[PDB]
Predict the structure of Spike glycoprotein.
Amino acid sequence: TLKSFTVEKGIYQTSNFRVQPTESIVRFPNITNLCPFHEVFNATTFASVYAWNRKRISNCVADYSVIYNFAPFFAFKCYGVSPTKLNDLCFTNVYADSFVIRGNEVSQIAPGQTGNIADYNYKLPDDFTGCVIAWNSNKLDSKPSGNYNYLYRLFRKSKLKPFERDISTEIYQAGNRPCNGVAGPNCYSPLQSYGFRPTYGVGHQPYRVVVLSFELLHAPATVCGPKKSTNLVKNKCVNFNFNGLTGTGVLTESNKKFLPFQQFGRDIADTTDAVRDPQTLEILDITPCSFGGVSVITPGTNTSNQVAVLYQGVNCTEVPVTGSNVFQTRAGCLIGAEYVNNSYECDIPIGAGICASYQTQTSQSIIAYT
Amino acid sequence: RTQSYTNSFTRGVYYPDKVFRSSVLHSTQDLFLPFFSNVTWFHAIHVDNPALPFNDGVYFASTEKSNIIRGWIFGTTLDSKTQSLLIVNNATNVVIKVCEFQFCNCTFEYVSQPFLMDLFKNLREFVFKNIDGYFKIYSKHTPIDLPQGFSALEPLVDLPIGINITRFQTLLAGAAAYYVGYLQPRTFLLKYNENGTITDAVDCALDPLSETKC
Amino acid sequence: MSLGAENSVAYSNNSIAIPTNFTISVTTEILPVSMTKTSVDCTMYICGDSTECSNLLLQYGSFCTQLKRALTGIAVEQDKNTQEVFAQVKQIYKTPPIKYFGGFNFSQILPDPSKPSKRSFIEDLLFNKVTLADAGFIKQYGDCLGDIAARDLICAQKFNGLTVLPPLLTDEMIAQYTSALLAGTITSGWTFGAGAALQIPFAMQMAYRFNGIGVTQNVLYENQKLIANQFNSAIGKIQDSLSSTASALGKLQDVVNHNAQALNTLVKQLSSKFGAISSVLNDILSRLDKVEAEVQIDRLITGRLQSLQTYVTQQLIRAAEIRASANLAATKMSECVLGQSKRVDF
Amino acid sequence: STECSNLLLQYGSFCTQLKRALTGIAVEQDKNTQEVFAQVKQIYKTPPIK
Amino acid sequence: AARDLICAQKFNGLTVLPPLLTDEMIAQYTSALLAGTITSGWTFGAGAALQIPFAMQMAYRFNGIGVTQNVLYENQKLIANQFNSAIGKIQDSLSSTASALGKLQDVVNHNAQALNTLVKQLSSKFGAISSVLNDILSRLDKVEAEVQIDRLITGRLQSLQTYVTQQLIRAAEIRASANLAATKMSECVLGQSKRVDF
Ligand SMILES: *[C@@H]1O[C@H](CO)[C@@H](O[C@@H]2O[C@H](CO)[C@@H](O)[C@H](O)[C@H]2NC(C)=O)[C@H](O)[C@H]1NC(C)=O
Ligand SMILES: *[C@@H]1O[C@H](CO)[C@@H](O[C@@H]2O[C@H](CO)[C@@H](O)[C@H](O)[C@H]2NC(C)=O)[C@H](O)[C@H]1NC(C)=O
Ligand SMILES: *[C@@H]1O[C@H](CO)[C@@H](O)[C@H](O)[C@H]1NC(C)=O
Ligand SMILES: *[C@@H]1O[C@H](CO)[C@@H](O)[C@H](O)[C@H]1NC(C)=O
Ligand SMILES: *[C@@H]1O[C@H](CO)[C@@H](O)[C@H](O)[C@H]1NC(C)=O
Ligand SMILES: *[C@@H]1O[C@H](CO)[C@@H](O)[C@H](O)[C@H]1NC(C)=O
Ligand SMILES: *[C@@H]1O[C@H](CO)[C@@H](O)[C@H](O)[C@H]1NC(C)=O
Ligand SMILES: *[C@@H]1O[C@H](CO)[C@@H](O)[C@H](O)[C@H]1NC(C)=O
Ligand SMILES: *[C@@H]1O[C@H](CO)[C@@H](O)[C@H](O)[C@H]1NC(C)=O
Ligand SMILES: *[C@@H]1O[C@H](CO)[C@@H](O)[C@H](O)[C@H]1NC(C)=O
């Protein structure tokens, strides 16, 4: 630590001890069904962008590795979450929406992105912890005469605020003249069809897009990945994977009175302290296992080589275990030095009226004294 | 109708999250009832216009001991033209509906225990809000007008409906009396006890003493 | 605001005014000496048993060796401050059993063996008045490993690598130093500050001090009883003033409150995001793949290093201020307890 | 600005520390002026003759 | 048309608080401490003021420096003339040279130049593309505007922390010099000094 080949007489602080974890415990909710992603992805037709279909996915087990088989898409690019880490931790509710757009409008379905579709057809929130899957469908959703099945909205009296859908169609009033259901000069139909031809460019081809909106925290989990569970253990510093919330600490019985809608217990420093078991409704306190500072007490290298270790601030009735002499202080306890009833001047300090020295005994050793 | 105004005092505080916290002071920013505001008192007597706007959050209260209030109808308009929210509770098991039947698309039928566990004064209190497609329900039963005490309301029932609501009304089985309070975005400081129940609170934008406390 | 009461001396070039009577008064003064010694572990604070954060921190730089060296120097400086202000006497004196010092009381100041700690009445009142917190390693990781319904801040600051070192000199040897200095001042006078202690009764010592201040020593031996009664009444008034008002030890309470507030801010700093998506290292390493988690961990590590630099710099400035106050206390102890000082209002 | 204040709120209590320190400096100068100059209890007055 | 820097420091959120004691109240304290030394000697620093003429008041202070009091009473007019000549000479010395007040000028100049270099650093870019917030929120959308705002906030917070640290060190130095001034005021005005060259 001191980056030197010789050290002088005195007390030195070097490192810290930590009790290593023993085993691994994984606790997941008891859900056995399989999520119908195939029904979402293998569909004959998709609804329009102004009338997008929303599917609720809950109370099943989701396999995210089978999505690459269903659709030949480019990539699975996501905000806040990674593709590769989906199967380990797990969520509460899954929202799946599917609609069809042009090639120019793929870039504006994003958090914080505005435009035409984002202002009038489908708007994403800024903290949107989900993502999209887009792929070309020029061989299915295109016709030589033109596929006129899909519509979009051009005019609206306000902008879109997120996760809302407009169904009713009204003739827009672009001037002071009222319309009253008549398409006049300043009155226009709110919907226009998509012109989809196979002879068009790649920027105007039809695209089948599916967005997967995922919800984080609260709402005790209904959908989780394919990882199996593990039997619960208590009073041991072990690893735990509780609903995807990993950590390291001591699992123990707790007497806290959680409300029935509450599942997590937070400390002052924004750290999980009390946890709810997903299998059975019991409350467990999470405390990290024992650690502390380590002090090295030594004389000079020119004098001797014998070293006494001070375990800083921890009781050594539970020390993770170096000689045979143990003396207890207020600052901790001392290993490798005995205790004498003599009273000398302080050669090297420890704290709380304890001083060490290198002295004769018969014959040279490290003694501690008041 | 008998439109009357009474002091709301300090009867609009609820748990803003589903996280247990013990003996800590946490400051949150959420839609809330301002302290010492005015609520609207109605004496709905039938042998009156029940048209009440939403205005981003509805605080509902009822001091009626008997189970005479049945449910609430929500939505934009009630003409069987657009989507409207139709909580009906027949005092046996509550039924939630998304359909727009005139004086009887998610279609979320939540058939379980009712929202009205009550059989002293036995005041009832409800807080309704809609942020990110979610109509929340907070409810408490306080055996005690508005008393000088605190009662933290709990998120007992959640609704993933995702519709748009502007106009709401009440339902009866004529001595109806209820209080309507409005919600505005504000900053609170909430005091948790050692048991995890909110016992003290302060508004951060009411008084310079309260702003100094915040 | 009023600057004070008005006064006007009727001055003329033939008028002198001399006193005809005196009054002995006792005045207290409070000075800090030391503060709470702390030490910060980087890897348990910034990371909290995460290997990727430790790899990024060892890739980052060598700031933690500087921080640990600075905090160790502050701790050694605090021990030096207490050693310099208190241990100025060479041999630990003891009081004689006979307590007749010319009619003076001398009972609230000398210690009594009835208490387990050899502490007098006024030291007991001073220790009872201060609402002391974070004494040292009085916990020894025993209560924090147990379960408490209302978790205090102290277990949270112990679990995040922020320890409080106990002082080298505890309360009993400080009380023994003060008892030795009182025994030397009462029996020997100022002669124990120069060489060995020379015994002298209290009346000739008070005559020595009156001859020092400029009054002929015949005034004392004709007014011994009045001086003794005024001294006893002044000690009683000082004891009543400490027993009534609890707002007299504001500087020491300010020192303890400053250290507690600094450690509370250092603990509560980890609740923020610093521009990252989450304040938990485990959530970042579990939700993301390698590169973006490295980006978020880089932002969090930069923010936590900035916070720790701010805390260490503030602690160094406070250490310099308390060292200056301790040096003033040490020279006041050297020039006023061990002798008679002629400087006006020192 | 509102959104810049929102992004500043993601940082911790840095500005709570800095505003508290300068207030502690600003209270200290009054103590210095009171300690140096106000060392006399009563406001004295010179005689009219000089 | 010629705008001063005081208005820029005013609108950029850098207020300056007034002192509690005004210029008149310090003058009354100094006049009172002059009225205590002339008409009472060092007796008003210990207990209550005692009336005493200036002849035995000057004759007391020669006994502190080892000269018997007959020297003053045999040489009073010469001492009075020398005191008046010294007062006139130090009045002319302060009236002629304006460079004697170098210590009190630096206290103003340090704080003025520190505020001036704090205000000037807002024109820096701190790794962004512009020194104006409103330009980059009129031009860029929020996804990378958040990153640009984060870079600007990091630079401004670093500059503010540097300024607060410099203010803390300067206040500690001024506190030490003020305690030295306080003990000099309490020892040399309110009484006589046996400390040589104090
Ligand atoms: C100097 O002051 C003391 C006060 O401490 C005077 O003592 C008082 O004398 C009166 C005489 O009537 C008594 O009633 C008081 O009880 C005494 N007080 C104390 C505390 O003993 C003393 O007399 C004064 N000296 C002179 C010469 O008058
Ligand atoms: C010295 O002062 C002490 C403290 O007041 C005196 O002790 C008290 O004397 C009164 C007088 O009867 C008693 O009522 C108290 O109970 C005593 N207190 C204690 C703690 O003993 C003492 O009398 C004074 N004189 C001497 C010579 O010691
Ligand atoms: C699921 O959870 C635990 C797993 O052992 C079991 O006790 C419980 O009965 C199970 N419930 C169902 C409905 O499978
Ligand atoms: C999708 O799955 C169905 C089975 O339900 C299958 O008939 C069809 O060929 C698959 N592919 C497409 C592109 O629909
Ligand atoms: C250490 O442990 C022992 C027994 O386990 C206990 O009696 C003691 O109080 C503990 N603490 C200290 C400081 O010795
Ligand atoms: C609430 O409204 C009524 C009618 O406008 C008014 O009289 C009353 O003062 C209001 N309450 C307040 C301002 O607290
Ligand atoms: C929603 O579904 C219900 C189910 O019967 C139906 O009555 C209602 O008309 C639907 N609303 C629409 C399609 O807007
Ligand atoms: C609901 O409809 C109103 C118009 O009545 C509109 O202003 C608002 O933006 C809509 N969306 C909401 C509240 O999310
Ligand atoms: C917390 O709950 C216990 C259990 O009955 C109760 O005795 C105590 O009074 C409660 N605390 C408060 C502050 O009411
Ligand atoms: C004393 O003061 C008076 C009043 O001014 C003055 O006339 C006189 O000359 C002074 N000196 C003596 C010795 O009286």
